Amino acid sequence: VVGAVDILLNHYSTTMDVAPVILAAHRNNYEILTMLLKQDVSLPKPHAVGCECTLCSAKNKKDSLRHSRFRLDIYRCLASPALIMLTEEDPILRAFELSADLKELSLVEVEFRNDYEELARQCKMFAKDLLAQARNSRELEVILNHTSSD
């Protein structure tokens, strides 16, 4: 609604402190995300499938399904073009790296492969689109000859 989101702020459920952002990102709404991210937010980091401490073992014991859905939701958020644009210094590199991760996860989480793969393709497309916006060749050079390493 945007207007409504504004009003509410003015005054499933995989979480609640960050669920607004997680949903917005899924809603891929730049405006709403801009509003929400105004207040500092910190999505939890999806621990890798490898962990075995209660960190994950306990959860994977209480509710494996929820845990899995939770992680997918975090990634579905992190892989939102809007969020990458707003929060990442180098949007392209993030898309490259995240696409790689979302693929690995497809292999690991065989159950939700299609989901994790769609997200990967989404990231790949985003980067292509951002390149498509180049207009002169000076820009192309800056982009294709830049490194994130000192």
């Binding site: 209480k62 509710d63 494996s64 399904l65 929820r66 899995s68 859905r69 159950e111 939700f112």
Partner: protein
């Protein structure tokens, strides 16, 4: 108060009522399909059936059998059957916790903890249900 006539069992000649087919079989056939087309509505099964999943499983099978017996109108019965099958998968997909998934897949109409419903699904060749990602995940753990 509303009621949908119960369609006679497949091949129920004993009932002379089925012997009405002699008169206006066309009507007989259409009327039957209409009844099944209704009993196979996801929403009706949801509102009326006590166990929506099991009802769908069973109805989807009967409809398949009818598809064979009623050579004509086969496609219709087959479509209605798929509607039922997908409905069951869709309800399963709406599960959010493992506790739920286990309660559903291990329920015995009437031991428990024997994945009774999953077994019924395999019996009724409910492939989509048995292949649902979350269901496959549980099985793997086992």
């Amino acid at each position: 108060r509303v009621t949908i006539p119960r369609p006679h069992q497949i091949r129920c000649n004993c009932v002379e009522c089925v012997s009405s087919s002699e008169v206006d079989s066309l009507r007989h056939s259409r009327s039957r399909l209409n009844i099944y087309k209704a009993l196979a509505s996801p929403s009706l099964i949801a509102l009326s059936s006590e166990d929506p999943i099991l009802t769908a499983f069973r109805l989807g099978w009967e409809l398949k059998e009818l598809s064979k017996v009623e050579n004509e109108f086969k496609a219709e019965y087959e479509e209605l059957s798929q509607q039922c099958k997908l409905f069951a998968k869709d309800l399963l997909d709406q599960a959010r916790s493992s506790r739920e998934l286990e309660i559903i897949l291990n329920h015995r109409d009437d031991k428990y903890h024997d994945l009774a419903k999953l077994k019924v699904a395999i019996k009724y060749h409910q492939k989509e249900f048995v292949a649902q990602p979350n269901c496959q995940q549980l099985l793997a753990t086992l």
